[PDB]
Design a protein around this ligand. Structure first.
Ligand code: AKG
Ligand code: MN
Length: 200
């Protein structure tokens, strides 16, 4: 896909059913919620987290916290299925020592989108981003270090895993408005699992 980035198409296909079962378990403790940006806007994507740290929004500035600001309780621990799939994907991508301490779970309803951004809330740039697609297909935008750099448009389907790091760790990326559709395992949405090393 780019220097230090690759797309493992259908890599998580066999694990998908189990991953989704665990998403449901995580959501039981920390429900999906549409976060409000530091700017005061409700995101179309619904999110939740598991692992030691969870990505969240604050009155002013994104940040990681071990506490779910909605439930006021710790985020659920990282499911075994998540941990194992993530490490296998990272190894295949060329990052064998990846040890994530956070997993952001995104749920896209039809029309939902995640505008172009950089994952720049993690201090240790040596750790890659492992992104798992589940359910409905979406168009993933992958660019460069500048918001105006040319964008690649790649369809991401159920089971696809994208890993980026090294030279492309801070590349801009996003998801275009989700097209309506149906998928036997997620029904009416697309889920995405984003593993990161947010601390240390
Ligand atoms: O849904 C995706 O494929 C991308 C999600 C993403 O960029 C994020 O969680 O920071
Ligand atoms: Mn991102």
């Amino acid at each position: 896909l780019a220097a230090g980035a690759v797309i493992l198409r259908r890599f998580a296909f066999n694990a998908a059913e189990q991953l989704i079962r665990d998403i449901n378990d995580v959501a039981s403790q920390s429900p999906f919620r549409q976060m409000v940006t530091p700017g005061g806007y409700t995101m179309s994507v619904a999110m939740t987290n598991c692992g030691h740290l969870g990505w969240t929004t604050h009155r002013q500035g994104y940040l990681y916290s071990p506490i779910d600001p909605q439930t006021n309780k710790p985020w659920p621990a990282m499911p075994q299925s998540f941990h194992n799939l993530c490490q296998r994907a990272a190894t295949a991508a060329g990052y064998p020592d990846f040890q994530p301490d956070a997993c952001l779970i995104n749920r896209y309803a039809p029309g939902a989108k995640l505008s172009l951004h950089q994952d720049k809330d993690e201090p240790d740039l040596r750790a890659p981003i492992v992104s798992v697609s589940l359910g409905l297909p979406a168009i993933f935008q992958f660019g460069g270090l500048k918001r105006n750099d040319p964008l690649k448009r790649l369809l991401l389907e159920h089971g696809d895993v994208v890993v980026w790091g090294g030279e492309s760790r801070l590349f801009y990326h996003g998801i275009q408005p989700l097209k309506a559709g149906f998928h036997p395992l997620t029904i009416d949405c697309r889920y995405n699992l984003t593993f990161r090393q947010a601390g240390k």
